[PDB]
GROMACS .gro file of C-alpha atoms in nm:
model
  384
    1UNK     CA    1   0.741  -0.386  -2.867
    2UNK     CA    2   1.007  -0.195  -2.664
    3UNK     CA    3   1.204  -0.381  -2.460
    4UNK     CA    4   1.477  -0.363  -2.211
    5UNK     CA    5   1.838  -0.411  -2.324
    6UNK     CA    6   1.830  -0.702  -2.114
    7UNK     CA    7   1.623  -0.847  -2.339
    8UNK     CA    8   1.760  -0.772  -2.616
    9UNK     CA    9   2.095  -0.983  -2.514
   10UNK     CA   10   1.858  -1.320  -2.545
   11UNK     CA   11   1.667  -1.225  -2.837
   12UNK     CA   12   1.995  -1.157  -3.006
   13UNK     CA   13   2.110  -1.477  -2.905
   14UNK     CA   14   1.849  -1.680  -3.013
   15UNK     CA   15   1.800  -1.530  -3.339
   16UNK     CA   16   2.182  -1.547  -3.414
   17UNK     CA   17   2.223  -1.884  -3.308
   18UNK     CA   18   1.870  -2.066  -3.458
   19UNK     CA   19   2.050  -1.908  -3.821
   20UNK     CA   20   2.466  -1.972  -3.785
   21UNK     CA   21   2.474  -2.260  -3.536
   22UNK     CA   22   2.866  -2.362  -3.549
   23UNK     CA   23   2.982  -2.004  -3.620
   24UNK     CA   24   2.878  -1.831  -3.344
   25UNK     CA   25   3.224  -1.948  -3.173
   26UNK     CA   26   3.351  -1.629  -3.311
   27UNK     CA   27   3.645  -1.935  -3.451
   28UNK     CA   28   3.752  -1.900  -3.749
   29UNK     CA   29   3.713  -2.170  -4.004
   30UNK     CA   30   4.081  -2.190  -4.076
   31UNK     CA   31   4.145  -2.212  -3.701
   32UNK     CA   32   3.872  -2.460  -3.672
   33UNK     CA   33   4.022  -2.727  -3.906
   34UNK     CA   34   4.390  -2.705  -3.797
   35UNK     CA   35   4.275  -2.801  -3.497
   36UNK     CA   36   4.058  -3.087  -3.591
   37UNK     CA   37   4.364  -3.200  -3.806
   38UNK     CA   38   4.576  -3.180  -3.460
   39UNK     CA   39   4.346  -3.364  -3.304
   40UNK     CA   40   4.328  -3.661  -3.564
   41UNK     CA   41   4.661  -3.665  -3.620
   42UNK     CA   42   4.720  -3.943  -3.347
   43UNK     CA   43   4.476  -4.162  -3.487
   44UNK     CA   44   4.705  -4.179  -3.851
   45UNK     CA   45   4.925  -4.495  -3.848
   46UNK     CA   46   5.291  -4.353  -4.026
   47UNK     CA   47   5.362  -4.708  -4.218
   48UNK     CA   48   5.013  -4.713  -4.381
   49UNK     CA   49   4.843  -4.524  -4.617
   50UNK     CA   50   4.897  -4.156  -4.567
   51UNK     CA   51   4.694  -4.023  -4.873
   52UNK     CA   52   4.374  -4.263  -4.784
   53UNK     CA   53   4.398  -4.240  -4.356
   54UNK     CA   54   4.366  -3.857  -4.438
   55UNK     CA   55   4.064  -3.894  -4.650
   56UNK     CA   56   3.895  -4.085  -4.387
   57UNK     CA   57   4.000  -3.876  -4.111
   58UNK     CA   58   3.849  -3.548  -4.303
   59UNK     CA   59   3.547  -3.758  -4.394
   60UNK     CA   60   3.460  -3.843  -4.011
   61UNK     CA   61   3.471  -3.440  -3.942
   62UNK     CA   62   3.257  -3.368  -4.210
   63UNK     CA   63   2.998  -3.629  -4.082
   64UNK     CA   64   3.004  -3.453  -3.775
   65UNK     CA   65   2.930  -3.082  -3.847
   66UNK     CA   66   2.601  -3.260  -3.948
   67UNK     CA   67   2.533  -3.418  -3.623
   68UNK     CA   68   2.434  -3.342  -3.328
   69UNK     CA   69   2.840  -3.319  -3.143
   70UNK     CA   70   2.806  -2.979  -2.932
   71UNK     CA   71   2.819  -3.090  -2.613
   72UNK     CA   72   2.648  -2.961  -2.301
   73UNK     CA   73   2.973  -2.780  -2.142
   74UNK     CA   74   3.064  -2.663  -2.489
   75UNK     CA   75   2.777  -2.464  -2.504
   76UNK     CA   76   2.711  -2.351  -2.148
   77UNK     CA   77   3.088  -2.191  -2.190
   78UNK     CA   78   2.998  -2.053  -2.508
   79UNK     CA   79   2.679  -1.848  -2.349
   80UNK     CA   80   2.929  -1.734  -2.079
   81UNK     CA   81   3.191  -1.620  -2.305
   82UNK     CA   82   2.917  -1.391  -2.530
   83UNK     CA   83   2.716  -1.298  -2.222
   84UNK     CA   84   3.034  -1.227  -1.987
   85UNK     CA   85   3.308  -1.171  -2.184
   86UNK     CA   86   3.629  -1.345  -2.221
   87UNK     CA   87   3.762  -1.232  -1.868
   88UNK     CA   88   3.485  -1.215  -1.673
   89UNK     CA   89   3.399  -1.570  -1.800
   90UNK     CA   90   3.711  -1.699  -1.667
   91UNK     CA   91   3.634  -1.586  -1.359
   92UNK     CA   92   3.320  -1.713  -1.332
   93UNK     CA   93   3.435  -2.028  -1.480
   94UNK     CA   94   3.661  -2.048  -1.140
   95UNK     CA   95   3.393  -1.980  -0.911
   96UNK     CA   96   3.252  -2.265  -0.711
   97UNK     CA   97   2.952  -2.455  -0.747
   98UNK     CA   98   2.693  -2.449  -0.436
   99UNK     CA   99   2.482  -2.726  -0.393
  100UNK     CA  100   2.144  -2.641  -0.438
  101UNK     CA  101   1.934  -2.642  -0.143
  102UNK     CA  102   1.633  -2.923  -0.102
  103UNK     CA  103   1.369  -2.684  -0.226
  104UNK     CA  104   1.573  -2.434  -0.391
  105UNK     CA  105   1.491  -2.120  -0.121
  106UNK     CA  106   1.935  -2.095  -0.145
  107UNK     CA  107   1.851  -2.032  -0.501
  108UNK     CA  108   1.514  -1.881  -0.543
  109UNK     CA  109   1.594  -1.633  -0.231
  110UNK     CA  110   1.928  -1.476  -0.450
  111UNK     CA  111   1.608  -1.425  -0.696
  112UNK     CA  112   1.406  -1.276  -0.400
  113UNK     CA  113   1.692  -1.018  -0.296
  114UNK     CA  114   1.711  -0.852  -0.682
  115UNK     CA  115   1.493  -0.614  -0.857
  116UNK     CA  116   1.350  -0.759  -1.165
  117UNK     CA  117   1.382  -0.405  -1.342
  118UNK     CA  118   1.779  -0.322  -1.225
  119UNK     CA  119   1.944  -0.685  -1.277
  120UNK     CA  120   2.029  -0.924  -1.537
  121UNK     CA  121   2.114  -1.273  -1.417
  122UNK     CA  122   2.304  -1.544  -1.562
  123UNK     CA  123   2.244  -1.909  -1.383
  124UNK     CA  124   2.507  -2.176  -1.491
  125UNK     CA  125   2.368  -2.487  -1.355
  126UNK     CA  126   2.574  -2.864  -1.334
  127UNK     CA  127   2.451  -3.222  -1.278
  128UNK     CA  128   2.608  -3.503  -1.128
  129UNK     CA  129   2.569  -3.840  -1.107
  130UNK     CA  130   2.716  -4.070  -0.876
  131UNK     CA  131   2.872  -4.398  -1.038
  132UNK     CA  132   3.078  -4.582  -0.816
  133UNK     CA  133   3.279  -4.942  -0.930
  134UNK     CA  134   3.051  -5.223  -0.973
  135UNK     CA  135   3.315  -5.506  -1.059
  136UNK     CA  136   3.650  -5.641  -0.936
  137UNK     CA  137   3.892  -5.792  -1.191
  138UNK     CA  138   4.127  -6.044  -1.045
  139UNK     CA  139   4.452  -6.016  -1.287
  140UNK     CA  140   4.804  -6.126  -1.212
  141UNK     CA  141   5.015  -5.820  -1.265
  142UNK     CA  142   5.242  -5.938  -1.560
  143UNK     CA  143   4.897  -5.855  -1.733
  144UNK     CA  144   4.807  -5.556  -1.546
  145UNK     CA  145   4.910  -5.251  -1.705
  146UNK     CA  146   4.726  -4.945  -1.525
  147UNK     CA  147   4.788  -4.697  -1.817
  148UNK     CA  148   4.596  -4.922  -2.035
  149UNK     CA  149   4.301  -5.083  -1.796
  150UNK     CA  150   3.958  -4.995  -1.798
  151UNK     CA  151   3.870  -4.740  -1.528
  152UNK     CA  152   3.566  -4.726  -1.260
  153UNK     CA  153   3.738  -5.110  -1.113
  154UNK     CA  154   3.858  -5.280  -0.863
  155UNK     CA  155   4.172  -5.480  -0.962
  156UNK     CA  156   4.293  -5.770  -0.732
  157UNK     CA  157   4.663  -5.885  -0.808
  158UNK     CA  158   4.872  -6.126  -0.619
  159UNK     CA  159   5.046  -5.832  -0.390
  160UNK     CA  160   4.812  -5.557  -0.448
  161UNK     CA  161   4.436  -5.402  -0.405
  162UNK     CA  162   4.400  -5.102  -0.616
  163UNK     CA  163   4.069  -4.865  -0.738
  164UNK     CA  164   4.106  -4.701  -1.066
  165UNK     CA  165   3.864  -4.422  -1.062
  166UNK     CA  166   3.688  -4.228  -1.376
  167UNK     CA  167   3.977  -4.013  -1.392
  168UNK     CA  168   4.218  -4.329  -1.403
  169UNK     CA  169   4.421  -4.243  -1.039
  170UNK     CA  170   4.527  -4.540  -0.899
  171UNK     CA  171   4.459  -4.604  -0.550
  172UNK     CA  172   4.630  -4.862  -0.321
  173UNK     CA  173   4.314  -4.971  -0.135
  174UNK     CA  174   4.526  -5.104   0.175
  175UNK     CA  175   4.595  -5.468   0.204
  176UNK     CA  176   4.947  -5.574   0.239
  177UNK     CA  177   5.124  -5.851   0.044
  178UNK     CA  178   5.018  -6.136   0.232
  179UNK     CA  179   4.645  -6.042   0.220
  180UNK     CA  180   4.670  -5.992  -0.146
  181UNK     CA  181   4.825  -6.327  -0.203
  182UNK     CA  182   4.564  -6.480   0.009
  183UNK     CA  183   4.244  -6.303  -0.147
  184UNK     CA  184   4.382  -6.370  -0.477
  185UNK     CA  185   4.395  -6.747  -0.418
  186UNK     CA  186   4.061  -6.798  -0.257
  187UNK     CA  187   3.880  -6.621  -0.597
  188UNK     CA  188   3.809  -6.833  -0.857
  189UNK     CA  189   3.842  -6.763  -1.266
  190UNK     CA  190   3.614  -6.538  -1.374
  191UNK     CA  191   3.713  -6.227  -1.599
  192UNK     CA  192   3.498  -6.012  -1.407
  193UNK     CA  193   3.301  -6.026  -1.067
  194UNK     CA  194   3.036  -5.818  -0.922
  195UNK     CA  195   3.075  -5.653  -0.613
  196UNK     CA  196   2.722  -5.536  -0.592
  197UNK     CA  197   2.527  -5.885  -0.535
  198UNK     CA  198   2.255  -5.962  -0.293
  199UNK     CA  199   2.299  -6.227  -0.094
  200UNK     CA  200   2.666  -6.268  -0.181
  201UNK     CA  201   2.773  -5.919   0.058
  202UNK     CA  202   2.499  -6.006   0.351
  203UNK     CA  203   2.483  -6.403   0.365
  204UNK     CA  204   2.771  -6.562   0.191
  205UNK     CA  205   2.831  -6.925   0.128
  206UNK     CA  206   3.128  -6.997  -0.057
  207UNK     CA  207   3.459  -6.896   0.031
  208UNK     CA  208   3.551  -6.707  -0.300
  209UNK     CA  209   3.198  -6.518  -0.208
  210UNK     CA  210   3.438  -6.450   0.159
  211UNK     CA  211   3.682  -6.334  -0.024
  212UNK     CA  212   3.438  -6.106  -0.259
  213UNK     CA  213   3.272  -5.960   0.031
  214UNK     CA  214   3.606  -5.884   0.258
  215UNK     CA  215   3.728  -5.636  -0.043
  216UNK     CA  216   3.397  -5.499  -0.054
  217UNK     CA  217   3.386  -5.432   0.316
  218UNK     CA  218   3.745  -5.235   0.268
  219UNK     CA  219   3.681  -5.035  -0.042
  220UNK     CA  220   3.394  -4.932   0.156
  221UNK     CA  221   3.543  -4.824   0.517
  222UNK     CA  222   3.798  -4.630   0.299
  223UNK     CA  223   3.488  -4.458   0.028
  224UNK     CA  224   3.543  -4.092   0.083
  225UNK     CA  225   3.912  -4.081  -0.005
  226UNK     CA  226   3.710  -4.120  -0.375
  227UNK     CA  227   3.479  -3.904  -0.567
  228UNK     CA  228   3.259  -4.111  -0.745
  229UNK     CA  229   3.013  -3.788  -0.829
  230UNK     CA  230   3.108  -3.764  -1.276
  231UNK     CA  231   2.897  -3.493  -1.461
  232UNK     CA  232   2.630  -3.579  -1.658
  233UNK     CA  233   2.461  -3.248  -1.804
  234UNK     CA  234   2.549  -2.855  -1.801
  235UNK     CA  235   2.293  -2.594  -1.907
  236UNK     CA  236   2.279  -2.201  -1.845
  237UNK     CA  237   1.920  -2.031  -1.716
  238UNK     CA  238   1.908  -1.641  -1.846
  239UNK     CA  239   1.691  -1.399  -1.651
  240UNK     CA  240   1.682  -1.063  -1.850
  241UNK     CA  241   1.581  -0.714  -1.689
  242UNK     CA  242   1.178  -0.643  -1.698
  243UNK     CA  243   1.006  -0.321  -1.777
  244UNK     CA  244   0.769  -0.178  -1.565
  245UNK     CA  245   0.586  -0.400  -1.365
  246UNK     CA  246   0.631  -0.662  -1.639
  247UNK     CA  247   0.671  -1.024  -1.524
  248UNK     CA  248   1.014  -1.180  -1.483
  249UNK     CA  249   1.100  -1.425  -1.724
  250UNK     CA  250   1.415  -1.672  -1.722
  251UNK     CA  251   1.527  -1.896  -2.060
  252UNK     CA  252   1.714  -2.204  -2.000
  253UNK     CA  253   1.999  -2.257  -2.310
  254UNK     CA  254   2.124  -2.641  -2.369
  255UNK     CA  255   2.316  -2.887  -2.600
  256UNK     CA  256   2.337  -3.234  -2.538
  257UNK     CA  257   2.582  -3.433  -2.714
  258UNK     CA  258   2.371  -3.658  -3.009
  259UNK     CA  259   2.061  -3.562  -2.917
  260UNK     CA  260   2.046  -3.165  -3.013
  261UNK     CA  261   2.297  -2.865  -3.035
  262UNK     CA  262   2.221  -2.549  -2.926
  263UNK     CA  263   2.077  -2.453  -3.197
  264UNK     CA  264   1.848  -2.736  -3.256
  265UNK     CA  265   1.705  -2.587  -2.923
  266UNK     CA  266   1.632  -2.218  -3.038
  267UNK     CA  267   1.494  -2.369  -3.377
  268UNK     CA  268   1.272  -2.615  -3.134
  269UNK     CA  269   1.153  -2.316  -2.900
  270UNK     CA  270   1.193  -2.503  -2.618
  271UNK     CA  271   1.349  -2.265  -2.455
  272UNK     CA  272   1.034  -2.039  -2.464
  273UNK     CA  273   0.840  -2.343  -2.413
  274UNK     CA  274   0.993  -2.384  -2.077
  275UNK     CA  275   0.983  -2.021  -2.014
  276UNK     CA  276   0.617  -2.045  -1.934
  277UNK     CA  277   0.672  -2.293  -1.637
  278UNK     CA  278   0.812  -1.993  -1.447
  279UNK     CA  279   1.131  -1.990  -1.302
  280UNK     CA  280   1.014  -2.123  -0.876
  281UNK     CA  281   0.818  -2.396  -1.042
  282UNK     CA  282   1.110  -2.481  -1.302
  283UNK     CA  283   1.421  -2.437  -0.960
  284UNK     CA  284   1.118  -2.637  -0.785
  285UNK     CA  285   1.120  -3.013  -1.035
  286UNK     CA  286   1.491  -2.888  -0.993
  287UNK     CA  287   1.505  -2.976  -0.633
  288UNK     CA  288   1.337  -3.289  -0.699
  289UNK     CA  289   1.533  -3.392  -0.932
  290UNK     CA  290   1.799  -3.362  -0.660
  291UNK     CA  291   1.654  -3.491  -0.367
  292UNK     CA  292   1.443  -3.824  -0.530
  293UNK     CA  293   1.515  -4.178  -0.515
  294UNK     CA  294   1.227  -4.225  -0.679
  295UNK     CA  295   1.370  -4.399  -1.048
  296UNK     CA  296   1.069  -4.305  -1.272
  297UNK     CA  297   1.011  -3.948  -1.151
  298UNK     CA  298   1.378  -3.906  -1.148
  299UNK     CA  299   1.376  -4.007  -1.524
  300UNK     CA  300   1.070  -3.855  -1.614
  301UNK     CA  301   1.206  -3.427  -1.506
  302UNK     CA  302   1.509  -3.515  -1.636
  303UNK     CA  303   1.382  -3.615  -1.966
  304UNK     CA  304   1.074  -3.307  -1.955
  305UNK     CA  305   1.370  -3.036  -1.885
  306UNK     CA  306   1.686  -3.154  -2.140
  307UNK     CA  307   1.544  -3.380  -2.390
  308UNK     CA  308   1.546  -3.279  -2.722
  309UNK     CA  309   1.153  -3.144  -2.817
  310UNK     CA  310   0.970  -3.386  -2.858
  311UNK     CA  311   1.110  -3.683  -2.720
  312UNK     CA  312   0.991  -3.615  -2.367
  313UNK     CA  313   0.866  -3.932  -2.393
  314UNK     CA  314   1.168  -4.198  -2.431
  315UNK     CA  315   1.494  -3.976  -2.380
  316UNK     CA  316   1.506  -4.155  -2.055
  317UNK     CA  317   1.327  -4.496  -2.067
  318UNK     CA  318   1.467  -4.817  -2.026
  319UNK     CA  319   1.815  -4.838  -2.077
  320UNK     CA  320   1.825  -4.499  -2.061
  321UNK     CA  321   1.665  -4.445  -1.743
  322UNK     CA  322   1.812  -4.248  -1.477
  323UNK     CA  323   1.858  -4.515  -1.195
  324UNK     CA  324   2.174  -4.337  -1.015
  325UNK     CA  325   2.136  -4.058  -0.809
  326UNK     CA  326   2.152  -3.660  -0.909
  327UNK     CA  327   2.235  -3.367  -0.742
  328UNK     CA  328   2.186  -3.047  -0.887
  329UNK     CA  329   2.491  -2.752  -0.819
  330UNK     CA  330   2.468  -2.389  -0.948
  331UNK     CA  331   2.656  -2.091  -0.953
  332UNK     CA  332   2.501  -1.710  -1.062
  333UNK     CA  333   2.672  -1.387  -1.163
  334UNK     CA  334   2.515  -1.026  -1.351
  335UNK     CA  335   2.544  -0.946  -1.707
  336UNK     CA  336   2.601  -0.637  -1.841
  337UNK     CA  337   2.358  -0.612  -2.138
  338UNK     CA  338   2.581  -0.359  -2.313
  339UNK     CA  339   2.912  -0.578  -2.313
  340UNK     CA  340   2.676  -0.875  -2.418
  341UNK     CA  341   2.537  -0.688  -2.703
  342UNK     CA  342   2.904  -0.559  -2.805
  343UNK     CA  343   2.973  -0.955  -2.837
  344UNK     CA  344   2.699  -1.035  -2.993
  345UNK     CA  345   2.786  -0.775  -3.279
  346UNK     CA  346   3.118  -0.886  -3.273
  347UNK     CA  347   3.043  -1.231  -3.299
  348UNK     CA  348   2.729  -1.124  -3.578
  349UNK     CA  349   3.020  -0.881  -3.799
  350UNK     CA  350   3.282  -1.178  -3.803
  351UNK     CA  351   2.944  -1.369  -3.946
  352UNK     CA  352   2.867  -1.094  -4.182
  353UNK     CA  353   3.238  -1.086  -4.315
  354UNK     CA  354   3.170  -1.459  -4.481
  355UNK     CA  355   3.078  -1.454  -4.849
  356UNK     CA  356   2.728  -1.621  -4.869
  357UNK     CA  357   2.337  -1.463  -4.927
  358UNK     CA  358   2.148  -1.654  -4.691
  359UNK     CA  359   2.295  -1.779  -4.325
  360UNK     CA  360   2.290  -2.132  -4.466
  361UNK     CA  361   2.502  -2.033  -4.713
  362UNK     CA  362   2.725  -1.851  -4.462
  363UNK     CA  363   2.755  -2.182  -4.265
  364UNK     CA  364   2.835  -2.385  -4.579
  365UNK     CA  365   3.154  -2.142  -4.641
  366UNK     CA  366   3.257  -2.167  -4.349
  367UNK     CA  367   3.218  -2.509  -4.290
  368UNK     CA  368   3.416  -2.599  -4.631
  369UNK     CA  369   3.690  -2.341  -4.528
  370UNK     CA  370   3.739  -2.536  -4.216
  371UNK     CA  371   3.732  -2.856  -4.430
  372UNK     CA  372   3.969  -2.773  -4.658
  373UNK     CA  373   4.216  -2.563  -4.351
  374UNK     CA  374   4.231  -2.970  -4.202
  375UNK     CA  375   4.331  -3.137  -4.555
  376UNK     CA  376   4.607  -2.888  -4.622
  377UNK     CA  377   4.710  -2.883  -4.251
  378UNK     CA  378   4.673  -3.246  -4.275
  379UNK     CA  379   4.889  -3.267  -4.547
  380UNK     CA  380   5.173  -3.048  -4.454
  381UNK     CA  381   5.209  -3.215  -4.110
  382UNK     CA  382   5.243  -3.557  -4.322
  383UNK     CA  383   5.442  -3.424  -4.601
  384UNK     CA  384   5.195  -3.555  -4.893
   0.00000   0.00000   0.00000
């Protein structure tokens, strides 16, 4: 089979990745484990036991390179760094999202204006969904700290109304003083109340239900000071240069934090699996999965595009359904098949360079070089 060069950049890909999972990075082991020592370091406690906190620190990393812990961005920037190039992914990485139209024609007409046979396309695609508060916490503010508090509330104190969002910003939602000290009063003693009751917003009774309802009505007048949009999955679409009059194909690439890495997905073929759906009926359930309100078709695309193979059926049901709403950005950019294949080889030589016969064996060195980079980093930062 000849095929274009274009190509070539996704076969590489796949092959490379289905064999060395974690060490396609390009990181090197040593640089891998100081930096997961770094990162556990605020989790030691000085007084206690230095010698025993590090074992257990070192053991949690080591369970992880075993599970499923690439997460969705982490590998959607990892496809733009080999496909791109360090640069050019920054850029790209800075571009803005647009929305994508209700049927995709924004997207599939950029498709529409390019020649299968001249271009290469990269597609980095994110999903939002929106989660706005759902309970108010009445606290007196001798017990209201709001580095500590849990975000995504509404906190009610005796002289103040504030929102702490997902990224823990703390909004003064208005009310004065007096206000506060009146609204404050008229609530009971709950811990927690919900401000998303029936019955209790449109036909209130008692007066701490008033009082409920009367910050409702002002956190809502005042709703798009907030963003309440938080992401919920990243994935990258690849749509290589044809030959001929050969049809054009496009590969979606995913992790997904403990389901599957991105390798799990090349070893699954779902990637080729999807492939066949073609790429208008594929940005099509795309635009529904925008648009819908409907709960069980929302859950049900969601699950069919980014579960991990073969749990289409339950990666969304029940608790995990998808009962908020989605909406479904993208951004585009060409590849240049020759840089991608220079960082694939790259990436493939700095592979080669680690002692080991078989890629498993490759992955094994380098995942006990990283281990043993944390201890000693560990170590030295703790003076053992």
């Amino acid at each position: 089979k000849l095929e274009s060069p274009g190509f070539m950049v996704h076969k590489k890909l796949k092959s490379m990745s289905q064999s060395y999972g974690v060490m396609m990075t390009g990181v090197p082991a040593e640089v891998l484990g100081q930096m997961q020592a770094e990162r556990s370091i605020p989790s030691i406690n000085k007084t206690g036991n230095l010698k025993q906190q590090i074992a257990k620190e070192v053991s949690k990393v080591c369970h992880m390179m075993t599970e499923p812990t690439q997460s969705c961005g982490q590998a959607s920037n990892d496809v733009c760094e080999l496909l791109l190039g360090k640069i050019e992914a920054e850029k790209f990485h800075f571009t803005k999202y647009e929305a994508l139209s209700a049927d995709g024609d924004n997207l599939k007409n950029v498709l529409e204006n390019t020649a299968p046979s001249s271009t290469n396309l990269l597609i980095r695609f994110e999903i939002d969904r929106e989660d706005p508060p759902i309970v108010l916490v009445k606290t007196k503010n001798e017990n209201f700290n709001p580095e500590t508090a849990v975000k995504n509330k509404i906190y009610l104190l005796e002289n103040k109304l504030y929102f702490i969002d997902k990224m823990g910003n703390l909004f003064n939602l208005g009310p004065g003083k007096k206000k506060c000290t009146q609204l404050f009063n008229a609530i009971g003693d709950s811990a927690e109340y919900s401000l998303c009751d029936p019955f209790v917003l449109e036909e209130p009774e008692k007066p701490e239900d008033f009082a409920i309802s009367e910050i409702v009505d002002i956190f809502n007048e005042q709703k798009e000071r907030f963003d309440f949009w938080i992401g919920s999955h990243s994935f990258t679409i690849y749509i290589p240069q044809t030959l001929g009059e050969s049809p054009r194909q496009f590969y979606p690439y995913q992790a997904y934090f403990g389901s599957h890495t991105l390798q799990d997905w090349f070893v699954s073929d779902k990637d080729e699996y999807l492939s066949r759906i073609g790429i208008d009926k594929y940005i099509e359930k795309l635009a529904v999965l925008g648009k819908t309100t409907n709960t069980k078709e929302r859950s049900d695309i969601y699950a069919e595009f980014f579960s991990k193979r073969g749990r289409e059926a339950f990666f969304c049901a029940h608790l995990n359904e998808k009962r908020q709403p989605l909406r479904v950005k993208f951004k585009i950019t060409e590849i240049n098949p020759e840089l991608a294949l220079k960082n694939l080889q790259e990436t493939q030589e700095f592979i080669d360079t680690h002692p080991g016969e078989n890629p498993s064996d490759k992955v094994e060195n380098y995942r006990n070089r990283a281990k043993l980079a944390m201890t000693e980093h560990l170590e030295s930062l703790l003076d053992i």
